[PDB]
Amino acid sequence: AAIDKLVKASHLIDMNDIIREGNPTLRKVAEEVTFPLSEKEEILGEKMMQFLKHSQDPIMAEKLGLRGGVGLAAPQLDISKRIIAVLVPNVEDAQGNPPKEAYSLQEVMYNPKVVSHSVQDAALSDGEGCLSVDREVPGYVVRHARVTIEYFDKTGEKHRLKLKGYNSIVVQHEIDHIDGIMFYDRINEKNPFAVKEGLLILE
Numbered sequence: 001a002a003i004d005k006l007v008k009a010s011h012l013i014d015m016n017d018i019i020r021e022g023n024p025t026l027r028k029v030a031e032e033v034t035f036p037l038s039e040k041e042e043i044l045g046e047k048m049m050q051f052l053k054h055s056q057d058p059i060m061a062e063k064l065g066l067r068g069g070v071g072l073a074a075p076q077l078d079i080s081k082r083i084i085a086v087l088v089p090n091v092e093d094a095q096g097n098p099p100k101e102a103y104s105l106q107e108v109m110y111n112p113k114v115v116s117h118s119v120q121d122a123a124l125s126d127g128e129g130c131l132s133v134d135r136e137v138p139g140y141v142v143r144h145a146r147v148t149i150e151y152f153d154k155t156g157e158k159h160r161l162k163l164k165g166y167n168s169i170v171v172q173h174e175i176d177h178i179d180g181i182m183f184y185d186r187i188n189e190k191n192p193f194a195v196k197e198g199l200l201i202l203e
C-alpha cells in the first residue's frame with residue numbers, strides 16, 4: 001500500500017510521493033489514529049518531518065527536486081490519517097545572525113484539532129501555495145487570526161496550545177487537509193482580494 005512504500009528505511013519522501021489536485025484522498029475526512037501508535041504511523045510522522053527539513057535545506061531540496069514547504073499532511077501522501085507535520089523557520093537578522101530559536105514551531109501532531117479561535121480573521125498578504133496544486137491561485141486565504149489547538153504527540157501525550165501569526169496560519173492549513181478542505185475553498189469567489197474590515201493582513 002502507499003504506507004509500506006513510504007516507511008521503508010532507505011526511502012526519502014520526494015515530490016513524486018505527493019498526490020495532486022483531483023485525487024479523491026484530498027477531499028476525504030482523514031481517520032483518527034489510535035494510541036499506542038503502530039510502528040508505521042510513527043515512522044510516517046518522522047519521514048514527513050524529514051521531508052520538510054529536506055525541503056528547506058538548499059542542498060537536499062536540489063538533490064531531491066523539492067519545492068520548499070512548512071507543513072505537510074498525511075492525506076497529501078495518499079494516507080487518510082490525522083497526522084500533520086509543521087516546521088516553521090525563524091529568519092536571520094540583517095547582520096546575518098541566526099535566530100535564537102531555529103523554528104517558531106516544529107511538531108509532528110496526531111489527531112490535531114482547533115478547539116477555540118479569535119473572532120478576528122487573518123490572511124497572508126502573499127496568499128498561499130500548496131504542494132499538491134500546480135496552478136497559480138491568487139487571493140487572500142481567510143483563516144482565524146488566533147487558534148487554540150489540541151493534539152497528541154507520537155507518545156500519546158496530549159498538548160493544548162494557543163497560536164498566532166504565521167504559526168496559526170500554517171497549522172490551520174494542515175488541519176484543513178485532514179478534513180478534506182483546500183486553501184482555495186477560503187478565497188472569496190467573486191474578488192480574490194476582497195478585504196472585510198478588520199482582517200489582519202500578515203506581511
Ligand SMILES: CCCCC[C@H](CC(=O)NO)C(=O)N[C@H](C(=O)N1CCC[C@H]1CO)C(C)C
Nearest residue numbers: 069070071072124126127128129130131170173
Ligand atoms: C502558509 C500556509 C501553509 C503552507 C503549507 C504549504 C505546503 C502544503 O501544501 N502543506 O499542506 C507551503 O509550505 N506552502 C508555501 C507557502 O504558501 N508559503 C511559504 C512561506 C509563506 C507562504 C506563502 O505566503 C509555498 C509552497 C508557496
Ligand SMILES: [Zn+2]
Nearest residue numbers: 012013014017
Ligand atoms: Zn518516493
Ligand SMILES: [Zn+2]
Nearest residue numbers: 042043046154
Ligand atoms: Zn522513532
Ligand SMILES: [Zn+2]
Nearest residue numbers: 050053054060
Ligand atoms: Zn537528511
Ligand SMILES: [Zn+2]
Nearest residue numbers: 115116117118
Ligand atoms: Zn468557531
Ligand SMILES: [Zn+2]
Nearest residue numbers: 130131173177
Ligand atoms: Zn497544503
Ligand SMILES: [Zn+2]
Nearest residue numbers: 114117143144
Ligand atoms: Zn475554524
Ligand SMILES: [Zn+2]
Nearest residue numbers: 115149150160
Ligand atoms: Zn479539550
Ligand SMILES: [Zn+2]
Nearest residue numbers: 184187188189
Ligand atoms: Zn472558488
